[PDB]
Design an enzyme around this catalytic site. Structure first.
Site, mmCIF file in Angstrom:
data_model
loop_
_atom_site.group_PDB
_atom_site.id
_atom_site.type_symbol
_atom_site.label_atom_id
_atom_site.label_comp_id
_atom_site.label_asym_id
_atom_site.label_seq_id
_atom_site.Cartn_x
_atom_site.Cartn_y
_atom_site.Cartn_z
ATOM 1 N N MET A 8 33.443 37.802 39.080
ATOM 2 C CA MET A 8 34.837 38.267 39.743
ATOM 3 C C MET A 8 35.191 39.785 38.617
ATOM 4 O O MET A 8 36.001 40.701 39.122
ATOM 5 C CB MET A 8 35.676 37.447 39.566
ATOM 6 C CG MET A 8 35.581 35.972 40.680
ATOM 7 S SD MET A 8 35.668 36.088 42.479
ATOM 8 C CE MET A 8 33.457 36.564 42.656
ATOM 9 N N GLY A 38 46.185 33.421 39.433
ATOM 10 C CA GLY A 38 44.951 32.626 39.883
ATOM 11 C C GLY A 38 44.005 34.768 40.035
ATOM 12 O O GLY A 38 42.887 34.830 40.400
ATOM 13 N N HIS A 50 42.107 33.878 50.831
ATOM 14 C CA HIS A 50 40.754 33.609 51.166
ATOM 15 C C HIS A 50 39.626 32.120 50.481
ATOM 16 O O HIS A 50 38.607 31.388 51.571
ATOM 17 C CB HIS A 50 39.782 35.056 51.115
ATOM 18 C CG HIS A 50 38.496 34.933 50.156
ATOM 19 N ND1 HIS A 50 37.984 35.413 50.592
ATOM 20 C CD2 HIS A 50 39.215 34.187 49.068
ATOM 21 C CE1 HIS A 50 37.165 35.389 48.625
ATOM 22 N NE2 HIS A 50 38.166 35.287 47.710
ATOM 23 N N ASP A 77 48.797 25.249 37.193
ATOM 24 C CA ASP A 77 48.365 24.796 38.600
ATOM 25 C C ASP A 77 49.037 25.751 39.728
ATOM 26 O O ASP A 77 50.364 24.840 39.478
ATOM 27 C CB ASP A 77 48.056 23.293 38.525
ATOM 28 C CG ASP A 77 48.025 22.939 39.878
ATOM 29 O OD1 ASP A 77 47.348 23.219 40.946
ATOM 30 O OD2 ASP A 77 47.627 21.678 40.108
ATOM 31 N N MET A 78 48.841 26.319 40.356
ATOM 32 C CA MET A 78 48.860 27.057 41.019
ATOM 33 C C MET A 78 49.972 26.640 42.356
ATOM 34 O O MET A 78 50.557 27.340 43.027
ATOM 35 C CB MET A 78 48.265 28.473 41.556
ATOM 36 C CG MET A 78 47.666 28.210 42.713
ATOM 37 S SD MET A 78 46.115 29.548 42.538
ATOM 38 C CE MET A 78 44.979 28.837 43.494
ATOM 39 N N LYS A 90 44.628 37.915 45.115
ATOM 40 C CA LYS A 90 44.067 38.937 45.032
ATOM 41 C C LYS A 90 42.245 37.694 45.104
ATOM 42 O O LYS A 90 42.214 36.775 44.299
ATOM 43 C CB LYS A 90 43.393 39.688 43.846
ATOM 44 C CG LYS A 90 42.363 40.834 44.431
ATOM 45 C CD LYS A 90 41.722 41.826 43.962
ATOM 46 C CE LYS A 90 40.683 42.759 42.325
ATOM 47 N NZ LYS A 90 39.336 41.468 42.586
ATOM 48 N N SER A 106 35.479 43.488 40.056
ATOM 49 C CA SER A 106 37.316 43.905 39.817
ATOM 50 C C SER A 106 37.534 44.899 39.742
ATOM 51 O O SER A 106 38.441 45.788 40.369
ATOM 52 C CB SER A 106 38.663 43.216 39.633
ATOM 53 O OG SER A 106 38.852 41.535 39.972
ATOM 54 N N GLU A 130 28.369 40.708 40.390
ATOM 55 C CA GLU A 130 28.868 40.036 41.641
ATOM 56 C C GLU A 130 27.768 39.624 42.439
ATOM 57 O O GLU A 130 27.840 38.395 43.031
ATOM 58 C CB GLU A 130 30.276 40.504 42.615
ATOM 59 C CG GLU A 130 29.081 42.427 42.825
ATOM 60 C CD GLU A 130 28.949 41.997 44.581
ATOM 61 O OE1 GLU A 130 28.125 42.620 45.187
ATOM 62 O OE2 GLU A 130 29.052 40.458 45.152
HETATM 63 N N1 LIG Z 1 45.417 25.801 41.720
HETATM 64 C C1 LIG Z 1 45.053 26.701 40.684
HETATM 65 N N2 LIG Z 1 45.645 27.202 40.131
HETATM 66 C C2 LIG Z 1 45.193 28.994 39.072
HETATM 67 N N3 LIG Z 1 44.796 29.767 39.527
HETATM 68 C C3 LIG Z 1 43.350 28.633 40.734
HETATM 69 C C4 LIG Z 1 43.561 27.405 40.781
HETATM 70 N N4 LIG Z 1 42.390 27.230 41.590
HETATM 71 C C5 LIG Z 1 41.387 28.312 42.109
HETATM 72 N N5 LIG Z 1 42.421 29.224 41.060
HETATM 73 C C6 LIG Z 1 41.258 30.179 40.708
HETATM 74 O O1 LIG Z 1 41.527 31.392 41.559
HETATM 75 C C7 LIG Z 1 40.757 32.373 41.247
HETATM 76 C C8 LIG Z 1 40.020 32.796 42.454
HETATM 77 S S1 LIG Z 1 38.624 34.240 42.226
HETATM 78 C C9 LIG Z 1 39.678 35.660 42.229
HETATM 79 C C10 LIG Z 1 40.315 35.849 40.174
HETATM 80 C C11 LIG Z 1 40.748 37.106 40.406
HETATM 81 N N6 LIG Z 1 42.121 37.132 41.301
HETATM 82 C C12 LIG Z 1 39.590 38.327 41.412
HETATM 83 O O2 LIG Z 1 40.336 38.969 42.328
HETATM 84 O O3 LIG Z 1 38.494 38.798 40.565
HETATM 85 C C13 LIG Z 1 40.045 31.256 39.310
HETATM 86 O O4 LIG Z 1 39.872 32.538 38.337
HETATM 87 C C14 LIG Z 1 39.902 30.264 40.252
HETATM 88 O O5 LIG Z 1 39.652 29.596 38.356
HETATM 89 C C1 LIG Z 2 30.405 42.065 50.022
HETATM 90 O O1 LIG Z 2 29.949 41.061 49.495
HETATM 91 C C2 LIG Z 2 30.710 40.260 48.632
HETATM 92 C C3 LIG Z 2 32.303 40.414 49.108
HETATM 93 C C4 LIG Z 2 32.399 39.401 48.107
HETATM 94 C C5 LIG Z 2 32.850 38.424 47.585
HETATM 95 C C6 LIG Z 2 31.267 38.547 47.201
HETATM 96 C C7 LIG Z 2 30.493 40.102 47.771
HETATM 97 O O2 LIG Z 2 28.781 39.754 47.785
HETATM 98 C C8 LIG Z 2 32.965 37.369 46.704
HETATM 99 C C9 LIG Z 2 32.667 35.217 46.432
HETATM 100 C C10 LIG Z 2 33.243 34.306 46.364
HETATM 101 C C11 LIG Z 2 33.146 33.700 45.957
HETATM 102 C C12 LIG Z 2 33.966 32.388 45.601
HETATM 103 C C13 LIG Z 2 35.355 32.883 45.458
HETATM 104 O O3 LIG Z 2 35.996 31.896 45.028
HETATM 105 C C14 LIG Z 2 35.962 30.407 44.835
HETATM 106 C C15 LIG Z 2 35.533 34.068 45.830
HETATM 107 O O4 LIG Z 2 37.132 34.190 45.158
HETATM 108 C C16 LIG Z 2 34.789 35.137 46.175
HETATM 109 C C17 LIG Z 2 35.302 36.231 45.880
HETATM 110 N N1 LIG Z 2 34.988 37.405 47.229
HETATM 111 C C18 LIG Z 2 35.645 38.585 46.882
HETATM 112 C C19 LIG Z 2 34.605 39.287 48.030
#
Ligand SMILES: Nc1ncnc2c1ncn2[C@@H]1O[C@H](CSCC[C@H](N)C(=O)O)[C@@H](O)[C@H]1O
Ligand SMILES: COc1cc2c(cc1O)[C@@H]1Cc3ccc(OC)c(O)c3CN1CC2
Ligand SMILES: Nc1ncnc2c1ncn2[C@@H]1O[C@H](CSCC[C@H](N)C(=O)O)[C@@H](O)[C@H]1O
Ligand SMILES: COc1cc2c(cc1O)[C@@H]1Cc3ccc(OC)c(O)c3CN1CC2
EC number: 2.1.1.117
Lengths: 357, 343
Positions: B160, B188, B249, B231-232, B245, B164, B106
């Protein structure tokens, strides 16, 4: 645990990039213009940005930058009785008030001449420098690699001759920082008083020697640097510009300055340059070295970080570049034929080191 | 105030993260750990374990110059060549002996050039209505960019996925709400690592992982997990229960309500959707709960239109607008929550 350390480690890239955006948006100067102990909201600050005047969301985005700088103690954060009291239980105030701190006062261009730490900090976080830092691991893995060369296909001074934006950002970062450093030098060091001529070897756009001649008007000032620096240098009172290559030939001068020059080069290159200076000095002349000296024992203090910051930057930016101890500087001067080394502490690790011919 | 005191405080800010990235790419923390987790070892001892450095006499001296800055910044201990040891922070950068998990993936994503190049355009969000720093830097939005740039897709997906695993270890210590579920759809869900860990703990759950085609096509096979591409914002598959998850945001209020109504339509009476996010606290300070929300708040401001972190009240308002009628917020650790929305 992991979810404590995510905060401590993840903030490290975010803080400098939020700081750079706030400097580019002129946040610190805008707060200062509200007065001595001002505390102002994101909406008050955005109201003073003509570029934001057709963006309803500007203040809410600005607040997201400023609240990270407040959590990091770069800005102070507060509110008022009227904000707590006037709306009632069903209104939420999202905007806190921000004020300057000791650190952010150093980001406000001075009323009299515009000086601050902004230009040097915009250079060290410039994309040219950060792109070099993305290749930092190559110095460990690969004999004779330089991160700047891996990133850009050329060494830094040759690259500056081809890239006018980078040339300006670098030259201005050195020049404005120069003014701050010479104000500290002049409070402590008296060795300019008896001089009649001073040649600044690698003197940049000439700002340093311009400030020396302004303080000591009997000094004839000469500024010497590469062609692509001299071509953009301003006309300064009492300063003559000279273009060339310090490793090939240094102009004759009665006394010489090397500020922020030796730290870019390895030992053999430093001794070659110092021998060129020796040949162009008279018996009785001196050269002054001005650098942040590496302390003999590193610790948690400004003197240690003032050397570690440029030590990491020069490792990324030029072959052989590094910060040095007093003993290491003495060894370079002695190898080039100088005698009577005099190290003079100025402030927070900054020294003048005199080498006598 | 003294300029030559404040040069140290301000000038180290860019240097520390770039030294940390180099040390992670050189696997410095794992190399120290292989001498023993309590070991104190020199730059030359660490370099001797890097086969790439074996014909570089100067490697250890360059390495020492990187490590002494991290030692001055509480990422390594330093003792009297100086000797370096791990700290609480750098133990979180050692891939675990059991499974290779740490914060490395990450942290390599949030300091990646794609992200830093977006942060170079951060001022555009203040000045220009409707601008997105990532779009200004790259000429496409982030999920469209990932579809055409396989390196970035991998760095993002792995950041990610490994993050996770440490998040769900914290969730399972506090939250029991997966017991007696028979089916869970992760909307997603990335490459499916989250739903793989839920099915490992709750072996009667039939897990479904749902994402975009360019993510699903590179996802591993996991026991008890079916992958579905779509596509959600157009439709979500039917599911008994759902997870969102680190999805809400990234999006503004109208996009969140559209997505949550899609989830409502695809849930049965009595189903729930779980929101997992770092929640913005009511007062911010110099503490983990504050920075855990401010870090992704700044990242999503740079990376996607409308993305931002939210309070419990703001999450409740989104669920209620989508038809959900019971909101249960559950604190997990350092600002991370599970928030249940009931149909
Ligand atoms: N229109 C759409 N349909 C489904 N997935 C989508 C989307 N737009 C973005 N996403 C997905 O949303 C995810 C956000 S990042 C978070 C990934 C995972 N839920 C975790 O918590 O680790 C990515 O994998 C991205 O490809
Ligand atoms: C506390 O430190 C961190 C906290 C978090 C992230 C990275 C950090 O370093 C990442 C950054 C990130 C960037 C882009 C994303 O989607 C386009 C996404 O889902 C996330 C998730 N978040 C989860 C919370
Ligand atoms: N071969 C060479 N001959 C002359 N100047 C050189 C040079 N190689 C580098 N320089 C100059 O060395 C300077 C280093 S930066 C320091 C500039 C100035 N002395 C100050 O303290 O602010 C740059 O201006 C650069 O162009
Ligand atoms: C304490 O903080 C700092 C200290 C110093 C610098 C920048 C800092 O932020 C700059 C960085 C730098 C980079 C490249 C150079 O030549 C290629 C160069 O001469 C300098 C000068 N040094 C002076 C010391």
């Amino acid at each position: 645990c992991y979810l404590s350390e995510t905060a401590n480690l993840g903030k490290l890239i975010c803080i400098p990039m939020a700081l750079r955006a706030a400097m580019e948006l002129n946040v610190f100067q805008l707060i200062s213009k509200f007065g001595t102990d001002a505390k102002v909201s994101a909406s008050e600050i955005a109201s003073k940005m003509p570029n934001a005047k057709n963006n309803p969301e500007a203040a809410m985005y600005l607040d997201r930058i400023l609240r990270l700088l407040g959590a990091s103690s770069i800005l102070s954060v507060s509110t008022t009785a009227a904000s707590i009291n006037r709306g009632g239980d069903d209104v939420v105030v999202h905007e806190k008030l921000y004020g300057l701190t000791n650190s952010s006062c150093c980001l406000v261009p001075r009323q009299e001449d515009g000086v601050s730490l902004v230009e040097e900090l915009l250079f060290t976080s410039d994309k040219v420098v950060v792109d070099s830092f993305f290749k930092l691991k190559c110095v460990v893995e690969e004999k004779d690699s330089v991160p700047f060369e891996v990133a850009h296909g050329a060494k830094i001074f040759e690259y500056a001759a081809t890239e006018p934006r980078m040339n300006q950002v670098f030259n201005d970062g050195m020049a404005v920082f120069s003014i701050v450093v010479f104000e500290a030098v002049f409070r402590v060091y008296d060795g300019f008083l008896d001089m009649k001529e001073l040649l600044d070897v690698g003197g940049g756009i000439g700002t340093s020697v311009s400030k020396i001649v302004a303080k000591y008007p009997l000094i004839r000032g000469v500024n010497f640097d590469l062609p692509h620096v001299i071509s953009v240098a301003p006309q300064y009172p009492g300063v003559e510009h000279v273009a060339g290559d310090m490793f090939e030939e240094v102009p004759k001068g009665q006394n010489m300055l090397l500020k922020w020059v030796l730290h870019a080069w390895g030992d053999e290159r430093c001794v070659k340059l110092l021998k060129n200076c020796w040949n162009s000095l008279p018996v009785g002349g001196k050269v002054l070295i001005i650098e942040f000296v590496l302390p003999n024992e590193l610790g948690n203090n400004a003197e240690s970080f003032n050397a570690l910051i440029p030590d990491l930057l020069l490792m990324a930016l030029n072959p052989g570049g590094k910060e040095r101890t007093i003993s290491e500087y003495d060894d370079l001067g002695k190898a080039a034929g100088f005698i009577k080394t005099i190290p003079i502490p100025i402030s927070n690790g900054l020294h003048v080191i005199e080498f006598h011919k």
